[PDB]
Design a protein around this ligand. Structure first.
Ligand SMILES: *C(=O)[C@@H]([C@@H]1N=C(C(=O)O)[C@@H](S[C@@H]2CN[C@H](C(=O)N(C)C)C2)[C@@H]1C)[C@@H](C)O
Length: 237
């Protein structure tokens, strides 16, 4: 596990949580207590707040408006779950605008998300600050989500859990969300989620690492799945 991490120029930390024990791996363990912008991982909290406050449903289609978006892959219609796995920022900015700054600010404080700051811009706060969050806070947030223990309706947490369903491996289920914050210096990479193992135990995790523009998009998930296989949490099929 440690030889894998410094096989790159990787400034990285990988955190796991089983509900009692926080474990740290990687080349820079202090990253786990350091706060970073959530970037696209905020789409987990955005969906939860939006569904809880009746601003959207998990079957509604957010239709493209015709204007070219940041990635051509985003130039189509999306449900919240489809936009979750595509990381479609414009769909979740439209949701944040439905929520509004005062409700969004009040809700993030209610659930104690990160530093609980959003400032004035309701569609920018998770992309360039001031909202920050540590990897430990991230593992504990998605772990609570996995257990239905966040301050949200149970069916709301279940809907967002399904939005994160990315792989079935026998009787083991992986739930995950990627993040790449490019509008900050330095750039930050996220891969957070949890494995619902075949034996019934849940293990939440969060990769958090420094990025630069040349980096391959698939590196975060590869690293995370590689480590999870080593840990025995999620063996390769
Ligand atoms: C969020 O952190 C930012 C988005 N996160 C991305 C990422 O984690 O890959 C990309 S999405 C990019 C285009 N869609 C591709 C994809 O995920 N699949 C094809 C599965 C990669 C984006 C930088 C967001 C704030 O811009």
């Amino acid at each position: 596990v440690q030889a894998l991490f410094n096989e790159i120029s990787a400034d990285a930390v990988f955190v796991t949580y089983d509900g009692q024990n926080i474990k740290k791996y990687g080349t820079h363990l202090d990253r786990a207590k350091t706060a970073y912008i959530p970037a696209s991982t905020f789409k987990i909290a955005n969906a939860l707040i939006g569904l809880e406050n009746h601003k959207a449903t998990s079957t509604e289609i957010f239709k493209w408006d015709g204007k070219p978006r940041f990635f051509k892959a985003w130039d189509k219609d999306f449900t919240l779950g489809e936009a979750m796995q595509a990381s479609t920022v414009p769909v979740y900015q439209e949701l944040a605008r439905r929520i509004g700054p005062s409700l969004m600010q009040s809700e993030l404080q209610r659930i104690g998300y990160g530093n609980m700051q959003i400032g004035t811009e309701v569609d920018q706060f998770w992309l360039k600050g001031p909202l920050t969050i540590t990897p430990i806070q991230e593992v504990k947030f998605v772990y609570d989500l996995a257990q239905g223990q966040l301050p949200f309706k149970p069916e709301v947490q279940q809907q967002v859990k399904e939005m994160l369903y990315v792989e079935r491996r026998g009787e083991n289920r992986l739930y995950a969300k990627s993040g790449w914050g490019m509008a900050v210096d330095p750039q930050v990479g996220w891969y957070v989620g949890f494995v619902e193992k075949a034996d019934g135990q849940v293990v939440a995790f969060a990769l958090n690492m420094q990025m630069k523009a040349g980096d391959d998009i698939a590196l975060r998930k590869q690293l995370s799945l590689d480590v999870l296989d080593k840990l025995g949490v999620f063996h390769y099929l």
